[PDB]
């Protein structure tokens, strides 16, 4: 995932040197921040959305 701040139109992503064997596709989408939980941590005290 990558942040898109308020009223921002440019979203540059970079990847350092890598070996792209068998890579097959990119796919994308855009989602609102407050809807997406901060996964990887058990509890998200700021996640005010249901």
């Amino acid at each position: 995932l990558y942040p898109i701040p308020a009223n921002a139109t440019n979203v540059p992503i970079s990847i350092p040197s890598r070996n792209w064997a068998a890579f097959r596709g990119w796919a994308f989408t855009r989602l609102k921040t407050k809807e997406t939980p901060s996964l990887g941590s058990g509890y998200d005290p700021y996640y005010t959305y249901s």
Binding site: Y2, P3, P12
Partner: protein, 64 residues
């Protein structure tokens, strides 16, 4: 917690590394935008100067 969480907001983890590169790109964009804006402003100024001449022309039109 309503007044508790008014401190220590969220964080941008994957935007630390590209700080320099993004700042450079932003400055380049700013340079281009400034050039475009200067050109547009000069064009608008000459257009306004032309547009005043219209008054003279019309007033001159009402000659009988």
């Amino acid at each position: 917690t309503a007044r508790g969480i008014v401190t220590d907001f969220a964080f941008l983890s994957p935007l630390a590394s590209s700080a320099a590169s993004r700042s450079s790109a932003r400055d380049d964009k700013l340079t281009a935008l400034l050039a475009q804006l200067d050109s547009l402003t000069r064009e608008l100024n000459v257009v306004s100067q032309q547009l005043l001449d219209l008054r003279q022309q019309v007033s001159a039109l009402k000659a009988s």
